[PDB]
Amino acid sequence: CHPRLSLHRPALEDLLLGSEANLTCTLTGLRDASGATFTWTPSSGKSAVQGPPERDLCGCYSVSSVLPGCAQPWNHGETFTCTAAHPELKTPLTANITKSGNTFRPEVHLLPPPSEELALNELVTLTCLARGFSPKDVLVRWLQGSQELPREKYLTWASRQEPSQGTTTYAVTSILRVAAEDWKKGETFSCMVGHEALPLAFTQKTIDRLAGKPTHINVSVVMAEADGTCY
Amino acid sequence: CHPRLSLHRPALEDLLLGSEANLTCTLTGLRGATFTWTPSSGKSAVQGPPERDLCGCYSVSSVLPGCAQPWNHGETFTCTAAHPELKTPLTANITKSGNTFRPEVHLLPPPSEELALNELVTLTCLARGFSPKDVLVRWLQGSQELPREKYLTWASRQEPSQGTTTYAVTSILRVAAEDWKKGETFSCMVGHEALPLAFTQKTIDRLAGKPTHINVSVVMA
Amino acid sequence: CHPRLSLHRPALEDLLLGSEANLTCTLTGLRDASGATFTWTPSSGKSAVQGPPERDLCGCYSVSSVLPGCAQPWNHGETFTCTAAHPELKTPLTANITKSGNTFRPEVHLLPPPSEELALNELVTLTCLARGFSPKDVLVRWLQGSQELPREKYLTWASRQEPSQGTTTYAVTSILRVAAEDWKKGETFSCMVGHEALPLAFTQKTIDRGKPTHINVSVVM
Ligand SMILES: *[C@@H]1O[C@H](CO)[C@@H](O)[C@H](O)[C@H]1NC(C)=O
Ligand SMILES: *[C@@H]1O[C@H](CO)[C@@H](O)[C@H](O)[C@H]1NC(C)=O
């Protein structure tokens, strides 16, 4: 039915681990096609190419656009605007976007395997929880030793909003299943989280067999020459 | 503009808690209609009193109630529709699932980095490896069941193995530090179709993360 | 020496395990005619079945009245009624039943094994104790790991009334005997209790080898 125009933030995986940074601005409710060419208030190379539209419920057309090169305006704190001229409305429709403020940084925790899984000796599982961050975009990757595991080895849920104790924050989880022989050989596994509010955009926590439910605390302290003309 | 038919399995919150379990056939059109159910069951249904969706065709539903024992008994249900815009009647059907699997539930203790700020401790519940993807999760404190507005549970994704198809789901609950240091206990419950007694429970308190022995030695040499 | 009529309740195993519900109405005593007219005052269509020709002592002919489908009306608060009239007893009589109020939730403990047999290394006992619930209807089941043990590997007493201050609460016990190799190896067990005052119909406690922590500190000069 009637058209409606929306704006979309740049993807998180391209700002952290990438080079290019494309914004995008779509408009649904287009009948077949139109002569809409968009307007963007910083216009340094506005290669706003649209391409073939997509089909909706019972057959409809929706066309969009992009704009490249958005690292330094998006992180420095610029502003953007998208608007297009089209038939099926009175006034041409507009939209604006800005990098958010009033953010929080995530608290990352890596939990050891439960004690019951260790006796069966088939596989174990390691849980990675991130908690209390204000925008809802995150990245979770795993490492074994120092080598990154491929994406199809683990499972990550989505970011959701947790019950309120003040400001509104979010959370996420992930699990990885590894062979129970390697847990006793002494390998290490570690979890990485990438978020906007962190200082260098990534942080990590690490766990192996000794650190984390050890059933053993051994510590030796040797203090050598306590009466020893300290200068 | 376009016709469509569906069925739906009865919801798990009604199959497990209070047995009044419905079974829904929808039709999305009329851009007047009669439905027919092949198991007799005596009690007839009620038609939808026909809301609209997606800016378009107003759908119409009809619900056959009182079918909680033939669902678990292994019976089969089909519902047959009719409409002016339909050339033939449409039919579809639904059965109970076969070759189920039961879940494995774990409750993990809070990380020790968290106890140093004196605000709130975090408990984590995980359930893994069950074949039909429908599940329930409920938390407790002692015996008092907590209201649902106090925790957060995720959906039920599919986990990456090569053997079969299995699923998993998580949940967190943040309780106060003063109640944690007193020795209050907390529990996590999971409900599944494939469990024999329909519920399983795990609990925790401020012990059971503490280590079993500590060896310190100070050498003045 | 002649009985009068009264009315029983549904079985808790059937009412909790999701299957069905019945309701029984009985008189007996003498081998007389089959004009035992059982009549139910509320009846949603499917009325009762005049039951099997059961016998009791000196030919005391018992037949009963049993109706299916009694979960939702019993649970939300109806008030059922049974009336009867006999060829000998042509003077009719009636009884009533009602789901109770004034409920309390149970408290379940599991207790570790008995140092005397902890040294003997032959067999160990685990005792489950429930206490303080309002009707005299419970279930007890035992588990190991995630697997349910059969009902022949333990014993359970009946629920006696406990004497204490003011109100009438109840209690019941059960014991389980298991060999020592898996008990010292680290296998775990569970005790479950079903009761109609709990909001999710069940609770469950588990036990395993509750010890304190060791601390060794040594100074070497
Ligand atoms: C952004 O647009 C909204 C309406 O779409 C308007 O209310 C708001 O003032 C705009 N903000 C700026 C900074 O232009
Ligand atoms: C009923 O369900 C079966 C699968 O159980 C399917 O193969 C069939 O197409 C369905 N419809 C019928 C028999 O009309």
From Swiss-Prot, chain A:
Main location: membrane
Subunit structure: Immunoglobulins are composed of two identical heavy chains and two identical light chains; disulfide-linked. Monomeric or polymeric. Part of the secretory IgA (sIgA) complex that consists of two, four or five IgA monomers, and two additional non-Ig polypeptides, namely the JCHAIN and the secretory component (the proteolytic product of PIGR).
Membrane topology value: Single-pass type I membrane protein
Gene: IGHA2
Keywords for the protein's UniProt record, in alphabetical order: Adaptive immunity, Cell membrane, Disulfide bond, Glycoprotein, Immunity, Immunoglobulin, Immunoglobulin domain, Membrane, Repeat, Secreted, Transmembrane, Transmembrane helix
Protein name: Immunoglobulin heavy constant alpha 2
Organism: Homo sapiens (Human)
Annotated glycosylation sites: 22, 96
Signal peptide: none
Spans within the Extracellular topological domain: 1-231
Shown residues in whole-protein numbering: 110 to 325 of 391
Keyword Secreted belongs to the record: yes
Subcellular location: Cell membrane
Record function comment: Constant region of immunoglobulin heavy chains. Immunoglobulins, also known as antibodies, are membrane-bound or secreted glycoproteins produced by B lymphocytes. In the recognition phase of humoral immunity, the membrane-bound immunoglobulins serve as receptors which, upon binding of a specific antigen, trigger the clonal expansion and differentiation of B lymphocytes into immunoglobulins-secreting plasma cells. Secreted immunoglobulins mediate the effector phase of humoral immunity, which results in the elimination of bound antigens.
GO cellular component: blood microparticle; extracellular exosome; extracellular region; extracellular space; IgA immunoglobulin complex; immunoglobulin complex, circulating; monomeric IgA immunoglobulin complex; plasma membrane
Disulphide connectivity of cysteines: 1-58, 25-82, 128-191
GO molecular function, one term: antigen binding
Chain ranges of the Ig-like domain: 3-98, 106-208
UniProt record, GO biological process: adaptive immune response; antibacterial humoral response; B cell receptor signaling pathway; complement activation, classical pathway; glomerular filtration; immune response; positive regulation of respiratory burst
